Ligand binder design. Structure first.
Ligand SMILES: O=c1ccc2ccc(O)cc2o1
Ligand SMILES: O=c1ccc2ccc(O)cc2o1
Lengths: 268, 269
């Protein structure tokens, strides 16, 4: 992997592994999501930021501030087959005082064709109190030199899927998968549940017949609260329609929302 | 990755990823186990075998026979750090009519030093009836040309740990993690639970304080029966012991049917 010529984006190639593919012998969306995090981490390292999933600058560490994902949006046109090489390009944009955005483009290394695209919204938080914050001028002015100054969007189209508001699933859910809990492999180096685990949990309540006859095309996921290591989650899904679904992850006991999202599936 | 000069073994380098490491910022044993399966798959593909976790010959496919793991034994001296490159060499050996063995050696790419080793026992089974069988002469004679003829062992030592008999944990277990179930990410391309998931489930019943103060050095795991996609597993652990040793048992949550048994050895950090 390497920073591009202008130093404002990063590229890395990955050979899809035998254990990374599903029943169609192509990479799962969780494998894709893990590769997006890996290339994001390598980009942060290359330009001098923290490497731990929080991409902090010097002033942020002094203030005990971290970056946390508010939303992940992924659209896949073709999942790479086992043994294939996929090239991923990533960059960050400053969105004023709201926060930052990290975008990605996926291409087939042999054809050069765009096979997928992703975008994510990140907000600043105190790591101890968990209190959200607007980005200050002194903090923002420090990282602006690592971003393209003009807008560069993986999802440019006006009123596109990536920015749509997601409603809250109403009980009773059409489908459910209850009592999901993280194991040590679901945790990151800081003992926090990996963001990709929540995508897997959302997908658990999709019926196996949809998975067997359809390909996932778009997933949009909002992150409201963390699942702790000793928490238990219920995954709820209701058809809203191509097949479209509305999703809700909540804590198994009190029903506290942790995530909400939508998926769009194309018949094979 | 590539076959070595003599065509009897295969080597591949891997750069450790950010999501592959634990609290020590080094690769977890499940990341290591996944890399061992990946290099085994690439070796099978390079010499013309099936690529699906069953490494079948044309004759085996005709007879609906597959290879299935009976035991996995891994010993790690140093876990590779995040960003480090690890080189893994793998080869297979025919063990007469009993079955086959796949061995691996792990090295730090920069120093060339052996950082770990692993060995696994594989038995032949009918895919449909799940009935085990000895290896036939016509099947064995077909794959012997892909193995070194003289013994080449990752664990040569006399009565070494890799071949030791594992006893059955007696109730009550000292520690337990109940109601473990696989999700789609735990499944392979054939919708079977990945062998590495069982290592993760075994480790779930080790107390967090042991994980925080010790490094896993050796794990030996026997595979008795598959966990199906809709099965639920209980993970049991009892201390048997500077070094801590444990006895492990995975069984189906309802009837208590054994799926795996194993042992782990941990050294204080
Ligand atoms: O790799 C990057 C690029 C831009 C960027 C901007 C802010 C930040 O905190 C981390 C960042 O990492
Ligand atoms: O890669 C290999 C090497 C030897 C070998 C021997 C038997 C077999 O079924 C698969 C095999 O794959």
């Amino acid at each position: 992997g390497s920073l591009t010529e202008d130093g404002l984006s990063y590229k890395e190639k990955f050979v899809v592994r035998s254990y990374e593919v599903g029943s169609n012998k192509t990479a799962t969306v969780e494998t894709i999501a893990n590769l997006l995090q890996e290339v994001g981490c390598n980009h942060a390292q290359s330009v001098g930021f923290s490497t731990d999933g929080f991409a902090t600058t010097t002033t942020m560490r002094k203030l005990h501030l971290i970056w946390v994902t508010a939303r992940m949006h992924i659209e896949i046109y073709k999942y790479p087959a086992w043994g294939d090489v996929v090239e991923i390009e990533t960059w960050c944009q400053s969105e004023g005082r709201i926060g930052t955005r990290r975008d990605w483009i996926l291409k087939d290394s042999v054809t050069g064709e765009v096979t997928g695209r992703a975008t994510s919204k990140w907000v600043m938080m105190n790591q101890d109190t968990r209190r959200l914050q607007k980005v200050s001028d002194d903090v923002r002015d420090e990282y602006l030199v690592f971003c393209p100054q003009e807008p560069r969007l993986a999802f440019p189209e006006e009123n596109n899927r990536s920015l749509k508001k997601i409603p809250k699933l109403e009980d009773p859910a059409q489908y459910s998968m209850i009592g999901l809990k993280p194991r040590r492999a679901d945790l990151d180096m800081n003992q926090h549940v990996n963001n990709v685990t929540y995508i897997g949990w959302v997908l658990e309540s999709i019926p196996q017949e949809i998975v067997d006859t359809h390909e996932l095309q778009v997933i949009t996921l909002d992150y409201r609260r963390e699942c702790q290591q000793d928490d238990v989650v219920d995954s709820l899904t209701t058809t809203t329609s191509d097949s479209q679904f509305l999703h809700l992850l909540r804590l198994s006991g009190d029903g506290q929302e942790i995530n909400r999202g939508t998926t769009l599936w194309r018949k094979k």
